[PDB]
Amino acid sequence: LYSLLFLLGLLGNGAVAAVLLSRRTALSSTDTFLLHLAVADTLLVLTLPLWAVAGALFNINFYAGALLLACISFDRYLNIVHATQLYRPARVTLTCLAVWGLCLLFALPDFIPQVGRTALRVLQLVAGFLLPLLVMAYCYAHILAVLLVSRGQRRLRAMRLVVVVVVAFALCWTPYHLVVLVDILMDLGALARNCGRESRVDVAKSVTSGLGYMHCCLNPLLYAFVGVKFRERMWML
């Protein structure tokens, strides 16, 4: 089953990368961020055979996932909540370098310590899953509120899609960071170590890593294939 996901990830990810990269003109901010995410997930799925330098690139891609997804949400909030003050393609390459740049800052130790790895885990939990999740929650809650006061036939479908995206992200990311937090507290002295539970926690690491792989493989299906614009390009190319 793991090998199937490997091809599924590359296949779907490549289509997203190819469709957007074949555009002959400028790409909107949402389009630019989606392209970065497709590349980010593309690298991670390449790791599958080995995991099932490798670790270092693994971390970079994982954070790229949430942060890029976090970046997508903020632009949607800006475009849909304050649509009157932001009427106008705005280049956003600056932030993409930062998000990829912030992964580099954290990714150095992987190429290169008890306290060092403790700080690594602390930063990972603080700024990799928690803050992005809060950002997504706030932005999409305001988007839902604005749409509920809107008028049209697309509002309901937009609400459904937003809820689906948020729920999928939560249910696919929480199980890994929960185990990471449990292990963090165990190391800090808030819990007790035992032979069986350590192996169970390693298996939990494995299972939640597979779940994250599933999310990375599903990213094309929930952010690209559901949009009207993307399908038109796919039908064109």
Residue numbers in the entry: 59 to 110, 126 to 161, 165 to 188, 208 to 332
Study authors write:
Chemokine receptors belong to the superfamily of G-protein-coupled receptors (GPCRs) with primary coupling to the Gαi subtype of heterotrimeric G-proteins and β-arrestins (βarrs). In this context, CXCR3 and CXCR7 constitute an interesting receptor pair, wherein CXCR3 couples to both G-proteins and βarrs while CXCR7 lacks any measurable G-protein activation but robustly recruits βarrs upon agonist-stimulation. For example, VUF11418 and VUF10661 have been developed as G-protein-biased and βarr-biased agonists of CXCR349, respectively, while VUF11207 is characterized as a CXCR7 selective agonist in terms of eliciting βarr recruitment and activation. Here, we determine cryo-EM structures of CXCR3 in an Apo-state and in complex with small molecule agonists biased toward G-proteins or βarrs.
In addition, we also purified CXCR3 in the presence of CXCL10 and reconstituted its complex with G-protein followed by cryo-EM structure determination at 3.3 Å. However, the density for CXCL10 was not observed and therefore, this structure is referred to as the Apo-state. However, some of the regions of the receptor such as the ECL1, ECL2, and extracellular portions of TM1-3 in the Apo-state, and the extracellular region of TM1 in the VUF11418-bound structure were not resolved well. Interestingly superimposition of the Apo-CXCR3 structure with the VUF10661/11418-bound CXCR3 structures reveals an RMSD of <1 Å across the main-chain Cα atoms. A comparison of the Apo-state CXCR3 structure with the inactive state and VUF-bound structures reveals that Phe1824.56 in the Apo-state undergoes a rotation of 135° and points toward the ligand binding pocket, and this rotameric conformation is stabilized by Asn1323.33 and Gln2195.42. In addition, Gln2195.42 makes an ionic contact with Tyr2716.51 and further locks the receptor in the active-like conformation. However, it is not possible to discern at this point whether these features represent receptor activation due to constitutive activity or reflect the stabilization of an active conformation by CXCL10, which has subsequently dissociated from the receptor. Still, there are clear differences in the orthosteric binding pocket, in terms of the positioning of the extracellular side of the transmembrane helices and the conformation of CXCL10-interacting residues. In addition, the side chains of several CXCL10-interacting residues are not well resolved in the Apo-CXCR3 structure, which further corroborates our interpretation regarding the absence of CXCL10 in the orthosteric binding pocket.
